[PDB]
Paper text:
In eukaryotes, the ubiquitin‐related modifier 1 ([name]) pathway is responsible for the synthesis of 2‐thiolated wobble uridine (U34). [name] is a two‐domain protein containing an adenylation domain (AD) and a rhodanese‐like domain (RHD), which are both essential for the dual function of [name] in sulfur transfer and ubiquitin‐like conjugation (Furukawa et al, 2000; Huang et al, 2008; Schmitz et al, 2008; Leidel et al, 2009; Noma et al, 2009). [name] activates the C‐terminus of [name] via an ATP‐dependent adenylation step, receives mobilized sulfur from the Nfs1/Tum1‐relay system by its RHD, and subsequently forms thiocarboxylated [name] ([name]‐COSH; Leidel et al, 2009; Noma et al, 2009). We heterologously expressed and purified [name] from [name] (CtUba4), a thermophilic fungus harboring highly stable proteins, well‐suited for X‐ray crystallography and other in vitro approaches (Bock et al, 2014).
Therefore, we generated a Uba4C202K mutation to convert the labile thioester intermediate into a non‐hydrolysable iso‐peptide bond between the activated C‐terminus of [name] and the ε‐amino group of the introduced lysine. Indeed, we found that Uba4C202K forms a covalent bond with [name] in the presence of ATP, while other [name] mutants (C202S, C397S, 306GGS314) led to the formation of non‐covalent [name]–[name] complexes similar to wild‐type [name]. The covalently linked Uba4C202K–[name] complex formed well‐diffracting crystals resulting in a structure at 3.15 Å resolution, and its atomic model was refined to R/Rfree values of 21.1%/26.2%. The structure revealed two [name] molecules with slightly higher B‐factors bound to a dimer of the [name] AD, while no specific density could be attributed to the RHD, which although present in our crystals, appears to be mobile at this specific reaction step. In contrast to [name] alone, the [name]–[name] dimer is fully symmetric and the AD interface falls on a twofold crystallographic axis. Interestingly, the C‐terminal GG‐motif of [name] is positioned in the same groove that was occupied by the linker region in the unbound [name] structure. Importantly, a helical region localized adjacent to the ATP‐binding site (aa 72–88) in the structure of apo [name] becomes disordered and flexible in the structure of the [name]–[name] complex. Therefore, the Uba4C202K‐[name] structure represents a unique previously uncharacterized reaction step, mimicking the thioester formation after the release of AMP that can serve as a model for this reaction intermediate in all other E1‐UBL and SCP systems.
Residue numbers in the entry:
A (entry chain DDD), B (entry chain DDD): 4 to 71, 87 to 236, 238 to 304
C (entry chain GGG), D (entry chain GGG): 11 to 62, 64 to 111
Write the structure that this text describes.
Amino acid sequence: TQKSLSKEEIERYSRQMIVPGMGKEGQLRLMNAKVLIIGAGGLGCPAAQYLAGAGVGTIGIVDGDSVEGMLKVDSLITHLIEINPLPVYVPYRFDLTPQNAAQIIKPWDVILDCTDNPATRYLISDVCVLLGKPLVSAASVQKSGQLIVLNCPPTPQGVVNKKAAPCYRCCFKKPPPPSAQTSKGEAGIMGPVVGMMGVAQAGEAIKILVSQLHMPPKGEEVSPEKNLVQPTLLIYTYDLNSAIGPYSFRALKMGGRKKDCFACGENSTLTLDGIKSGNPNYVQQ
Amino acid sequence: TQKSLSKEEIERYSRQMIVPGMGKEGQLRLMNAKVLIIGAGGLGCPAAQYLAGAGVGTIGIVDGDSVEGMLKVDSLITHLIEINPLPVYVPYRFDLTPQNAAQIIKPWDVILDCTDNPATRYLISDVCVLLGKPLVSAASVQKSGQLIVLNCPPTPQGVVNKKAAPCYRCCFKKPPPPSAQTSKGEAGIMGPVVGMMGVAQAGEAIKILVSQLHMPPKGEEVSPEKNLVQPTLLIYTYDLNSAIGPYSFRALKMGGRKKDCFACGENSTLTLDGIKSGNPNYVQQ
Amino acid sequence: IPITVDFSGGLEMLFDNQRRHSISLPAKDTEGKPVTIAFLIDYICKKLMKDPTDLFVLDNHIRPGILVLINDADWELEGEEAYEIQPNDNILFVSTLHGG
Amino acid sequence: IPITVDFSGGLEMLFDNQRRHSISLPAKDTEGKPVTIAFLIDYICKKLMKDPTDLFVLDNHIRPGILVLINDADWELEGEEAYEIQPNDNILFVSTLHGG
Ligand SMILES: [Zn+2]
Ligand SMILES: [Zn+2]
């Protein structure tokens, strides 16, 4: 709702206010924006740091885990105020589940996924899809990382009749593999990988808000130079036995909603009521 | 010199200790390592953050500038202890010049460049070359950023007879353009760009140390799968009107030492004594 | 047919830290009809592998985990495991990442 | 000769936020001999430009600032401003970044 800029705010944001695309007009977008981050460790931290810094209006965070007593949500928020006092930080000081995930998302304009568990990753997309929200998902384990921008702009469930942004299921159809799953606790993590990926995640979120890419298009089709409906899956491999290689960042363009997707496709048996009840039980393991 | 790992250290580093390439062996490399960052604003912060976190032995920082009273060096170091108490942080609480730059580098194993001024950027390479040190240079203005790994492994000045890593002059031969120069203060900066670039810079530095790539090779040639002697110049353009695009990360392989380079090439009239005196006066503007 | 094969996403670990793989194939399969990508999976897993099978292919089919791309194009629309390989094609095997 | 031309490194700002540029060229220059890259600079700066000249080319030559790459290959070894352009070549104009 805020229409004008504080001398306080004008001073803080002037460095990125004077860039093509980001006027008093472009900045107010971010200040009224409401972004949510699911997961506070690893990708959460840098993602949150670069939203905070950018002056995203409200920044949510969801993690019931503690540090290695004190929840990691709290630790991080305490950190973020130092970067930017002005944003409203909103800690969900527990872990997301089917019972709540519906409740935890309906408020927020853009969803970031840093969840680190495959079951949860599927859950979010489902909900995000149903509620009609854009997902910037991102993953990192060991020496490798990857990122993608799903359901932007958010096309209603089952509307296959129009060129329409792919869901996480549409992409990554049925896998997760049961015994091929490594965790960040299991397999470790190099710092710059999770860092690159988080920072980029924030990058995509900011973009979505500032250029208003979650806004459905004018019977007109959506420009393909946005890479929204046909979005790249950027794969970062970190080779600590080599310098930056031509095959360091490979960009795999992806298909629009799979007409037969379980969730966002034609004849989906997926209901918000469903997930709550335990309907698509996330026993895929 | 340290041969063994504290329970303190073993606890902190276990997450990246269990990754291919990074044993008790690979980690001790970083702990005895001495890295220097020239420039504390913008690219300095994230670069320093991901070295600190990684447990780089000693981390130097050089910036005479204050915040927007209190020097930005001090501000940042204060920040870094929070991330990792164990490293020795070393603030050069002034600005680098020809008179000192020689003095400020001779100690350090790896040099990071975040300097933001073209004259300075050339100065460092010159010195770095002469003293025989590897440079991870990186730059960012407005919506675009780029990074490269020069003089790794460090090949002595004038040794053109062997396949040899390119200097900053060898690359970017005579330009900087006098009136085409925009500063970060002049043209602004989006957050995720400088962030990506800094984090990557740390990335390259860590790699150099952990895999020991500053170490000259066995009469044997240097593997080209390191991309050291023929190193990529990664260019990141941030389009806030689009999602991650295939042309988001473009990787421009670069030429080994230009035999006729002013500085690191055959028949160079460049002396450490020279720069001190004001010899190649950095009036190129 | 000489082609380049790549790995990424914590798969190449299986193939001894190697991502880029160039090996020429026989133009014809075992039963004389042209090489399919059912072939490459079998050839690779049996010969090119440097590790224990469970992680790449199980029950005579690739693990649901991995994506396959032909010239950076979805494998599913272009042939989906029964694809006549081309004289200079690029095939990419990336294990979908579910950690963060 | 139809080729794709690209900008990056805070240059494309000059060409109205556009990076990718496809325009077919005459195979022969003004004096009848084959198109050189002295040509592309002249054609682009005069017609394709959307801004005031100082920033791209001055004194009948590109600003020292910029690098030119032909199929992601150094321009200097391959012809250096007097290069017979090829039927599907890619030429990249990137302004070297000296800020941070
Ligand atoms: Zn779907
Ligand atoms: Zn040189």
